[PDB]
Amino acid sequence: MKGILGVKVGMTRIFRDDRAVPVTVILAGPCPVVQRRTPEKDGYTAVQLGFLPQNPKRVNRPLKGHFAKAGVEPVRILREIRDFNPEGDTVTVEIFKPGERVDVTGTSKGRGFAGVMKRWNFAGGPDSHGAHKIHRHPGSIGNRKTPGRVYKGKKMAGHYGAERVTVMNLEVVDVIPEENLLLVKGAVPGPNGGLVIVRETKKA
Amino acid sequence: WIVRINAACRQHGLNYSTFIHGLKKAGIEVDRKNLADLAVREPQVFAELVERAKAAQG
């Protein structure tokens, strides 16, 4: 199960032989590994990567002080990529091949305290025809005496977005070796600058 | 008191219903369930009360 740390840098169109492909260029550069798990130590046996460089003065040293591999500590979240196993130095893009289906797991855009019509795609009341204040309200939220209480998960307003979102079955278009970039087929979760992990899709 | 007497007499080889049947028939109504403090405090004589109660089954 191949995977990588990446960051969205924007999206555009590429041109194939006949059809244009809505690619997302994504910067999954050289990722230093810092720690390997073990079945005899923790069991689940994952591998811990970290990707983007940090100057050694903003660190606080429970973090500064990892051993020989990746002495220069990275910035972002040291993600473990779930039974992937590299050789030991770094993970480049050439682990991936063009024509493979890759999963992208990132962090989507939080819309704030988003509404119920924008959040759960309701319909609401009409604008005309006497409607007092129902133009964006959800409406009825239950029943009278039996059952009484409102059920759990009634799909009302709250914090829509800003959660870890996985978009799946993305085919690899092109690989850029000199800057270590990837070109997925659109619809990556996350903004311009949102870190993702890119695994292998199954879909066997 | 029934839980203390039934708890203390059980490891001697007889439960509460076996224990009281010797006391009501043998004329040795002494315990009367207020005397659980020999089954708790000093059991070397309450064990002798078990010795007097186990022979009074017939």
Partner: protein, 138 residues
């Protein structure tokens, strides 16, 4: 006030073997050992029901057509969430929840018996990290 003081000292350790002994009938002497019926110094408010570890939580014998038919119940507050799990699934994986639910259904329900559920460890081994000295009783 007459001197009926329990004088609580030294909670002890008893492990119970479950090779071929049936549940229920096992869980009643586990119930009286977790309660404290074996001790003559009884007072029902202080927890004197001693530390009991049960070994060999696997292959507990059940009688009749109860395996595959005795279905447990675990409710979620979400609507439609009534996950029905059979006894053969409860013995295929997670064997400890059968005995923990059997002792939980027999202990008292207040903050005393809720504390008594802490004093009952379940292990399908035979191995357990309680390693001072463990006398076995049946």
């Amino acid at each position: 006030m007459k001197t009926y003081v329990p004088k609580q000292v030294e909670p002890r350790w008893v492990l119970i073997d479950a090779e071929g002994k049936t549940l229920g009938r096992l869980a009643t002497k586990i119930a009286t050992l977790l309660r404290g019926k074996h001790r003559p110094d009884w007072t029902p408010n202080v927890a004197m029901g001693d530390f009991v570890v049960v070994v060999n939580a696997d292959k507990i014998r059940v009688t009749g057509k109860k395996l595959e038919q005795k279905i447990y119940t675990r409710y979620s507050g979400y609507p439609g969430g009534l996950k029905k799990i059979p006894l053969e699934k409860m013995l295929a994986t997670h064997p400890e929840r059968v005995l923990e639910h059997a002792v939980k259904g027999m202990l008292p329900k207040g903050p005393l018996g809720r504390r008594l559920f802490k004093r009952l460890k379940v292990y399908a081994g035979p191995d357990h990290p309680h390693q001072a000295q463990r006398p076995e009783k049946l």
